[PDB]
Write a protein that binds this ligand. Structure first.
Ligand code: HEM
Ligand code: HEM
Ligand code: HEM
Ligand code: HEM
Ligand code: HEM
Ligand code: HEM
Ligand code: HEM
Ligand code: HEM
Ligand code: HEM
Lengths: 162, 140, 149, 145, 161, 147, 147, 140, 140, 147, 144
């Protein structure tokens, strides 16, 4: 834990702050290749989805849930991370089709390939979301809504992209 | 002060900690090994079952017949009428042997001991300790 | 080619050495645990007492000296956590020796004691450890320091 | 900003423990800071000609960076005692004083630590809290307010 | 399968002991244990690995090389076919540009597709090759303390073309 | 004929379905129907068990008989995973049946059938062959000499 | 209003960040700032606690007060995974506050805010809503039988 | 003989074996159950907390208040000045009840007992046994 | 009554429960801790090995030399001739110190105790208890 | 020269192959061949060990010597995962060799080879380098205070 | 070159690891014979009484275990030079009643070596094994 194996022929195990750096830290220099730097996943406006099961809170019965990325910035001097903002939205089931809408911020880590977000502050029903893109393509995921303190797993939804 | 609600609980907790099969024998032999270390004289009457060495078989057999008795007792402990009948038949088996009335009062002290470790902090001592008395007095 | 201080040993060291700092704050730990190591040195070799005049060793709990006790353990700490990847460590310690060089009146035989204090001092403050391992590594740290003296 | 805010003083004291970790990730956590800094101020490398600061992956330099964190660990370790801090901190003054450091640089090295900490740390920390405390240390080494 | 047994089944599993693969005659009722008796590694074949991680430190090399003097088949009983292998390692340090090429002798087993190298030096480091069984351009083989059966250092070898 | 092994695991589940409770309501009603099925084919045996007031089907006593039969019978089963403690407890349970009058070596081989005719109605999945084979080697040894 | 469950796990982590140490340097400085924030809004209360030499902010005694407040407060939390042992220890801790004079039911509802007032500034991730909900049901059970 | 180092060790080992939450109560009740089996008279003073049956609640509550005390003690055990203050306030609570000075010396014997099983062979007896005395004497 | 078969069994069971390495020391120290809690006087003779505190090292060293002895004994227990030779040399080591003949008879009681928990219900007490006597008498 | 660590695990397996048994037939024959190989190069030492009736190769006594050498030697090894208990037991085992006459510092450095010349013929996989390194630091700590 | 009384027990240990428990033993037998017959095709004539035409027939499997079973006794005891010569001498009168050339059980020697190596854990000393079983071969032949 706290490290991410490289992408190539020969697996090494390199620390997470050294990807997309602008210096080769591997054997083969996997860290410079566009098979890794590709930003296709956090381009603004992308949105993930897939109905969520809730185990821990709200017990709402499975209903759709989307994540969306409202604005992304990558600072020229510390290219290791992509800082970004989002809005989680999931369907409360009352009578009419309705949705509560959290609002988020967080970073995207090229190592883990996993973006992780958190509730902003003074926002109703403060949740956070952890999406791991460890599958092959840059689409699909295995996310989970969590409580921001414990990283305890509130609701697990395996999400795709349209 | 027992026999109702406070009795019912003893049944449920008897089910759990008492275990099953090879785990049952290991329970019984872990009981007697308590009291014989405490009160060395108690092994005098067991010369019939070769209570020389408790770990030997044939005593292993005995001590299980013992606990099996508590099953009959504790199992019927709800219905008061039929309870005395077994308690009646039980005492008869203990009339013809040399006992002291203090060994009984000793027994329940060291039995509720061993259930402590397996149940940790969870149970009503009050429920057991008083409701094992209703079993023990019928033997006098 | 060195056999001494083999790879597998210092992994044990770092694990055991980290059991102390599992607790938060910890500033007060290594102030205190450092305050003992220097005083307990002075009561064996009295000569060295003169050397610490600049930091005012005369005050044990004194602030001006306390801040010096941190920087010795802290300086020792980075040495242990850097044991892996050797070629850096050589440079790391080399810079300490030269730091003790410009200071005058520091006799090589002092460290030989300071090891014996610490080698028998350490076993009181830890849960478990293999003395054979620590013996190997601390010969590495100490012997390489003073190589400028 | 806040004057160290003696409660908030220990806020960062706790967070720092979680970020600055055990194991060889520390050596990696160092590399981040510097690789970040030099990209903001290209000509600051001139000051390190003595430590082989041309290339940053050379072993002789790695040693240099640990002492830097090692040193800074001492600072953040003790914001409780205003005496011992001023003693320990004052030591650092005479370290840097013997050479020319503009007030521009260690303003940027401030910006560097923030970003790196955020990434390394568990998604939650208060910037304005950190911003004050290390800036108090920066006012320290500069020698004068 | 069970323990030392080997699994021949293509579509209808049949469990057979390890000593009958390339035995010389049909034991698996499929007939799928006799197809494989062609040996994959021919004399002159040269494999070069790159390091994965290394704690058994003689020279802790960057990467090491392996060559075949000669394969040979004991005629009469041939699940196992013995080998002569050089192991070349071209080191570098502060001082020296040292070299090494220790000869050893292993055996390749058609049974579980592993090859072995019996310790070249007295240090007691066996090299345990393992192919996947369908490839033979690369193997993930890694070194072992011959006495203790413990994984110490891995290398990923490739054939050169 | 060879209790074997698998047959014992077969039992241990079968017996766990009938015995599962802390109440005696079920364990009674089952075993009572065993003898109630026995006496219909050997009315002569009913002349025995007079000590327990057999004449009353519903007595405050008679139950206190059958209850000890079960807890004795159940005591056997829970030993099958551990033998050598069986023999000892087997030989004991034998001698308690020779100290009285009226034991028909013939009646033991009777009740062997009695379960086989009153088991398959309490449970659903049941192995007649297994329960019948490992039960004789119990009874065939509690009627070792005679009675 | 319903401590619920999840709120308690929320607490047990929050409390583990502030309490983590074997030294008392941190646990003191935090709780001292609670009352130091309390007295600013109810200077009348400061007339009480005269027994402990309150007027000295850094006394060799006053610390020995706040220290027992924490270890008492921390004693509450570590019971939340096991209730029914809370009530007993709750009722006890209540009666120790009725044996003196000058403890107003109004003061407790004050310190409820005092943590919310300044407890965040120590931590980073913090749930105000949770800590505020499960804290009343602790304190509103201390002021029940008290004026 | 209790000093800066040999004291420090007791803190670290207090953290580990003492555990947390439901594991803490289970620790306390496992302590008293030792001594009451050894010295039966000791349960006389507990008639206030219903120390009739230790497994009952409200004693469970008590025994945790007990251990919590050692926390306050052992936690501040580095700074000598402020140590006596708690030791001063602590003794006051024990003045008004019937004790013997030998029960204290008994207590530390059976406390260091239970830590044995959880720590096996790893700890300094010398550090504990002497440094619990500096806690115990302040109560006299 | 010790011979041939009933001896052989003690060897096999000695192999298992006795364990190895760090598990061995933990076994020895768990033995003595039994008897010293039972018979407090027994720690008088150990002032040479600092038997003040058994958990301290140097006693840890001792108690392992002890068990190692039983190895030599029990290992050769088949061949009767060479057995006495070690028993002869062994007693010599115990001549020069103050003992009671009852401590020996006490020892085997508490040794076969600890093997109980690790072996549960499986072993021949008769085999051990009698065949440890053939070891113990040679020391008198 | 630095027992290190991995060398000790190397030993613990090597020693487990030679020592594995509850019988003494094997442990004897191996260690006897150690000294039988020793005396061939230092016949002067054979003048010592007269107390044990050395002159009889198969005595009812002499075995009872070598047996205690093994169980003493094996006692060392099983401490290597736990040090600090070694020194104590090391210093003890040292003093038992100074109370007699005819034990030369030269003899120990001899038997260091004695295992190496004839220790493997018993095993198959064996590390000479390891066993030879960690064995000196055992023996060179016995001959310290001895002539 | 000789039984080398230390080395005598070397193989005694190794053999225990190779000749195992379970049904692999029955398989470990098959190897030896399938190896032998491929060296000496006409040696099958000697087994006409045991159904040695085909080697997978049940009647033959029994035969091979006794062979290993017998050989286990040999390697089991090289400690006592008395009991060996007693037990071994028994085997002499077993084979003596028929014609076994000195060529064959030279090949059956080569057979066991290879099979053991495969079955065993990658480490053993040939020249150690070579001596000990050859001592047994000098045994059954009746004269050295
Ligand atoms: C606490 C409830 C007790 C119950 C339910 C109980 C039950 C029984 C039973 C069922 C038997 C055997 C009857 C048979 O085999 O047919 C028996 C025998 C025996 N019980 Fe108990 N018993 C109890 C307490 C005690 C105690 C405290 C002792 C103390 C030593 C004791 C000593 C014996 C002895 C020596 C025998 C053997 C009689 C013989 O061999 O003839 N029992 N008991
Ligand atoms: C064993 C590891 C040791 C380490 C890591 C260490 C580290 C340090 C460091 C880094 C300094 C310089 C602080 C600075 O540059 O501001 C220092 C100063 C000093 N050390 Fe050490 N030291 C060690 C052992 C010793 C020993 C054994 C002695 C004396 C016997 C000693 C005597 C001194 C003295 C006299 C100073 C002068 C400080 C001053 O002038 O204020 N050190 N040590
Ligand atoms: C919080 C901020 C900083 C801290 C705590 C800090 C601390 C230190 C420490 C502890 C050393 C070690 C001195 C030694 O061991 O000899 C050092 C060396 C050094 N620092 Fe910094 N430093 C900081 C910022 C800076 C910045 C921004 C620069 C330049 C842009 C700078 C330039 C240097 C140089 C050149 C040395 C090495 C001088 C030499 O080799 O003689 N420092 N610093
Ligand atoms: C099939 C398995 C049977 C078992 C395991 C069994 C076991 C027992 C046990 C344990 C008792 C109580 C003994 C005591 O309290 O010491 C008992 C009582 C009795 N059993 Fe059975 N029994 C079985 C079948 C039979 C049969 C078939 C008969 C007669 C046809 C019989 C006749 C009796 C009688 C008469 C008593 C009462 C003893 C008395 O009068 O005091 N049992 N049985
Ligand atoms: C909010 C949670 C609180 C808890 C858990 C708590 C708990 C305690 C405890 C355990 C003691 C020590 C009792 C003893 O040593 O026997 C104590 C003392 C005291 N508490 Fe509190 N307390 C709290 C709040 C307050 C508040 C708000 C006040 C007043 C406004 C107050 C007034 C006092 C006083 C005066 C004492 C001193 C008793 C003496 O003079 O010896 N407490 N408290
Ligand atoms: C070993 C260190 C000890 C500490 C730190 C300690 C601490 C305390 C504390 C904090 C209380 C309760 C004060 C309160 O609730 O406000 C108390 C009560 C009590 N202690 Fe101790 N105690 C210790 C030893 C003992 C011992 C050995 C006994 C032996 C019987 C004892 C008997 C009691 C009793 C009976 C009470 C009950 C007072 C009551 O309920 O009114 N204590 N102790
Ligand atoms: C049961 C089998 C026992 C064996 C095999 C045994 C064996 C030995 C051995 C080998 C030594 C040390 C010789 C040496 O280091 O060179 C020794 C010393 C000692 N034994 Fe035992 N012992 C046994 C039982 C006991 C018991 C029950 C006691 C009870 C107190 C005892 C007390 C001692 C003492 C005090 C020493 C120390 C002698 C000294 O250091 O001067 N032993 N024993
Ligand atoms: C290499 C490791 C060795 C170990 C671990 C060792 C250990 C021991 C031990 C434990 C004893 C029995 C002591 C007792 O019963 O208290 C013993 C006896 C003896 N050892 Fe060693 N020994 C070693 C090597 C040697 C060597 C090389 C010599 C001489 C060249 C030697 C000479 C003796 C003698 C003479 C005795 C007999 C004591 C007597 O006369 O009663 N040992 N050894
Ligand atoms: C180390 C080598 C050998 C050993 C230990 C060995 C041992 C034995 C044993 C134990 C038997 C069992 C006879 C019985 O149970 O009645 C046997 C039978 C036999 N052996 Fe061997 N044998 C060896 C080599 C050979 C060789 C090389 C041949 C032939 C080329 C051979 C031919 C036979 C035959 C034909 C029988 C069966 C005779 C009959 O059924 O009447 N053996 N052997």
């Amino acid at each position: 834990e706290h490290e991410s194996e490289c992408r190539g022929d020969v697996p090494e195990c390199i620390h997470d702050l050294l990807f997309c750096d602008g210096e080769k830290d591997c054997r083969d220099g996997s860290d410079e290749d566009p098979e890794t730097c590709s930003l296709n996943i956090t381009h603004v406006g992308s949105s993930y989805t897939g109905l969520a099961t809730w185990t821990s809170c709200e017990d709402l019965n499975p209903d759709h849930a989307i994540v969306t990325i409202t604005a992304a910035h990558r600072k020229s001097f510390f290219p290791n991370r992509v800082w970004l903002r989002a809005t989680l939205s999931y369907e409360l089931d009352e009578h009419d089709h309705t949705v509560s809408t959290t609002q988020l911020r967080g970073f995207y880590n090229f190592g883990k390939r996993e973006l992780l977000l958190a509730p902003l502050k003074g926002q109703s029903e403060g949740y956070g979301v952890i999406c791991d893109f460890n599958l092959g393509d840059d689409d699909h995921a295995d996310c989970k809504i969590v409580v921001p303190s414990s990283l305890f797993v509130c609701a697990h939804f395996n999400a795709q992209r349209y | 002060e027992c026999l109702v609600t406070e009795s019912l609980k003893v049944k449920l907790q008897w089910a759990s900690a008492f275990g099953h099969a090879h785990e049952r024998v290991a329970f019984g032999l872990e009981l007697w090994r308590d009291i014989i270390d405490d009160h060395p004289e108690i092994k005098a009457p067991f010369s019939r079952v070769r209570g020389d060495n408790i770990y030997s078989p044939e005593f292993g057999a005995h001590s299980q017949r013992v606990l099996s008795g508590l099953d009959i007792t504790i199992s019927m402990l709800d219905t008061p009428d039929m309870l005395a009948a077994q308690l009646a038949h039980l005492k008869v088996q203990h009339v013809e042997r040399n006992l002291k009335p203090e060994f009984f009062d000793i027994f329940l002290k060291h039995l509720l001991h061993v259930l402590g470790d397996r149940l940790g902090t969870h149970f009503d001592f009050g429920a057991w300790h008083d409701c094992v008395d209703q079993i023990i007095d019928g033997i006098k | 080619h060195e056999h001494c201080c083999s790879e597998e040993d210092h992994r044990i060291v770092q694990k055991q050495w980290d059991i102390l700092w599992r607790d938060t704050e910890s500033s007060k730990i290594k102030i205190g645990f450092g305050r003992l190591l220097l005083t307990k040195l002075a009561k064996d070799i009295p000569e060295v007492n003169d050397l610490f005049k600049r930091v005012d060793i005369e005050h044990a709990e004194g602030p001006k000296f306390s801040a010096h006790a941190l920087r010795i353990l802290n300086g020792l700490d980075l040495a242990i956590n850097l044991l892996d990847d050797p070629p850096a460590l050589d440079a790391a310690l080399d810079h300490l020796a030269h730091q003790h060089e410009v200071r005058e009146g520091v006799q090589k035989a002092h460290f030989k004691k300071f090891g014996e204090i610490l080698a028998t001092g350490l076993p009181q403050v830890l849960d478990d450890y293999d003395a054979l391992a620590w013996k190997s590594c601390l010969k590495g740290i100490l012997t390489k320091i003073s190589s400028r003296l | 900003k806040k004057q160290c805010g003696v409660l908030e003083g220990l806020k960062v004291k706790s967070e720092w423990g979680r970020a600055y970790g055990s194991g060889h990730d520390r050596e990696a956590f160092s590399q981040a800071i510097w690789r970040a800094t030099f990209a903001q101020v290209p000509e600051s490398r001139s000051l390190f000609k003595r430590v082989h600061g041309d290339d940053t992956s050379h072993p002789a330099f790695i040693a240099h960076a640990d002492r830097v964190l090692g040193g800074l660990d001492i600072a953040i370790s003790t914001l409780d005692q205003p005496a011992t801090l001023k003693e320990e901190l004052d030591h650092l003054q005479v370290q840097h004083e013997g050479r020319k450091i503009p007030d521009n640089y260690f303003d940027a090295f401030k910006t560097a630590i923030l970003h790196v900490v955020a990434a390394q740390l568990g998604r939650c920390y208060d910037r304005e809290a950190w911003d004050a405390c290390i800036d108090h240390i920066e006012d320290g080494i500069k020698g004068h307010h | 399968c069970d323990e030392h047994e080997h699994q021949c089944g293509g579509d209808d599993p049949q469990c057979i002991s390890k000593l009958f693969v390339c035995d010389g005659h049909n034991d698996c009722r499929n007939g799928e244990d006799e197809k494989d008796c062609t040996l994959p590694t021919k004399a002159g074949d040269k494999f070069i690995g790159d390091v994965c991680f290394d704690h058994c430190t003689k020279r802790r090399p960057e990467h090491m090389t392996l060559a075949f003097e000669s394969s040979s088949i004991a005629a009469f009983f041939t699940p196992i076919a013995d080998l002569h292998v050089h192991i070349e390692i071209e080191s570098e340090t502060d001082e020296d540009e040292s070299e090494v090429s220790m000869p050893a002798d292993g055996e390749y087993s058609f049974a579980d597709h592993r090859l072995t190298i019996h310790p070249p030096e007295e240090d007691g480091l066996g090299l345990v090759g393992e192919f996947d069984g369908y490839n033979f351009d690369r193997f993930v083989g890694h070194i072992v303390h011959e006495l203790s059966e413990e994984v110490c250092a891995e290398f990923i070898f490739h054939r050169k073309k | 004929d060879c209790c074997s092994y698998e047959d014992r695991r077969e039992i241990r589940h079968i017996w766990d379905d009938v015995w599962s409770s802390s109440f005696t309501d079920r364990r009674v009603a089952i075993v009572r129907a065993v003898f109630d099925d026995l006496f219909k084919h050997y009315p002569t045996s009913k002349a025995l068990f007079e000590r327990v007031k057999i004449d009353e089907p519903e007595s405050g006593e008679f139950k206190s008989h059958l209850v000890r039969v079960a807890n004795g019978l159940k005591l056997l089963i829970n030993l099958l995973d551990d033998t050598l403690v069986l023999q000892s407890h087997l030989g004991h349970l034998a001698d308690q049946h020779i100290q009285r009058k009226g034991v028909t070596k013939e009646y033991f081989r009777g009740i062997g059938e009695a379960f086989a005719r009153v088991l398959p109605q309490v449970l659903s999945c049941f192995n007649v062959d297994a329960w019948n084979r490992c039960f004789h080697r119990l009874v065939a040894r509690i009627a070792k000499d005679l009675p």
